[PDB]
Amino acid sequence: KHSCIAVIDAGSTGSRLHIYSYDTDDTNTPIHIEEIWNKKIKPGFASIQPNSVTIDAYLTMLLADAPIHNIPVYFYATAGMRLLPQSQQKKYYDELEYWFRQQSQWQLVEAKTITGNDEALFDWLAVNYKLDTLKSVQNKSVGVMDMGGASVQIVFPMPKNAEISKHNQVELNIYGQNINLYVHSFLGLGQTEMSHQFLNSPSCFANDYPLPDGESGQGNAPSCKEEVTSLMNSVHKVNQQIQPLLALNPVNEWYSIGGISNLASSQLFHFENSELTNQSLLQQGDNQICHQQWDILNGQYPDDEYLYQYCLLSSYYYALMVDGYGINPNQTIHYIPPEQNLDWTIGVVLHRA
User: Fold this and answer.
1) How far apart are CA 58 and CA 159, in angstroms?
2) Is residue 230 annotated as involved in ligand binding?
3) Is 156 known to sit in a ligand binding site?
4) CATH for the stretch 1-114+343-353
5) What distance in Å separates the CA atoms of residue 271 and residue 261, rounded to the nearest whole number?
6) How many Å apart are CA 61 and CA 29, to the nearest integer?
7) For residue 9, with 0-12 CB atoms within 10 Å meaning exposed, 13-18 middle and 19 or more buried, which class applies?
8) Which residues bind AMP 2 per the record (predicted)?
9) Exposed site from 19, 33, 47, 162, fewest CB < 10 Å?
10) Which residues on adjacent β-strands are paired with residue 253?
11) Is 140 annotated as a binding residue?
12) Any known ligand binding at 37?
């Protein structure tokens, strides 16, 4: 009845296969995109031994039960593979290429580690497809932030600029309209990776939270924020790279995908309309977690295994958006509810199907 395409997201913690059906409109653009099958496997591809037996077992577990036959597949690895040496990446792709050559059910189009800039493009397309803002010329500038586990991405409209790296600019035409986007990714600034630098920082944890080194949490969101900002601006140069461009290319609406919704959904936070402001986020984290006695808090919410990190995470999100990107603390940030199942792989269908 329809066209179909498979996209494998080979992420840091696991790989997820998505199979989509779609139609194509008179602009040569996919419409009515629907996920018809999903499969997730652990652990991350970049964590398994890159030999034939291990790769065969892994790809077989991921793909064997798919209800499809003879479908194009894109295998796109993200930050987890980007953190591996390149010579090491090649071992995986040589095995994977051979595996797909031995079978007929899957027509491998591309298998590669995509850049964070590529990921940012797909993030923007996925979100804008969900918001139904692609089929018409908008006039409002929509920006997307992905708060990932290992990298973070930011993407917003910006006219082509010869003084900016080609790698941070994308041109595409969707539903008949030319789009120019600025894209950027910060590898290592994702919440899981960055957190590994802050675990013994007492300003980043609830009072009396037991830090790995034996010291006690003594939370203070502004202090935690300042420490996170140093990583962002001195190592990653976030503000120096992003803030001037955003100044000159103002975004009217911001949407975030990734980890914010998990935090914003906690019973300790109060956000409405699936949105927040950074000012409110930092205040709530500071009051409810950073300056809160840990044993009491944990006793009241014993099932929430991520709550202990919420002083750090609220501080970190503020550091990234306000001190890094230069977003006003009172600007509304929409976040995509986790129940919505919005996935960046939709952007692959839009761009490449």
Assistant:
1) 42
2) yes
3) no
4) 3.30.420.40
5) 10
6) 32
7) buried
8) 13, 40, 42, 262, 306, 310
9) 162
10) 142
11) no
12) no
